[PDB]
Amino acid sequence: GSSGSSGHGERGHRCSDCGKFFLQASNFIQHRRIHTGEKPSGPSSG
Ligand SMILES: [Zn+2]
């Protein structure tokens, strides 16, 4: 149904892979990497 990523939060940066929170973009970027590596059987990167 009509729905998606509303977000609308210009306060820090929250992760979607795990669900954490950050304040410094950089710190938020170096965090999204930890997830970058292995992928679950099924959905592959394109
Ligand atoms: Zn994360």
**35 Cβ neighbours under 8 A, 6+ residues apart:** 15, 17, 18
For 11-46, which CATH class?
alpha beta
Method used for this model? NMR
Kindly give the distance from the C-alpha atom of residue 12 to the centroid of ligand 1, in angstroms, as a whole number: 14
CA distance 20 to 31: 9
Per-residue b/e over 22-31, b at no fewer than 16 CB within 10 Å? beeeeebeeb
**Are the C-beta atoms of 37 and 28 separated by less than 8 Å?**
no
Kindly give the distance from the C-alpha atom of residue 40 to the centroid of ligand 1, in angstroms, as a whole number: 15
Who surrounds ion ligand 1 at CB < 5 A?
A: 15, 17-18
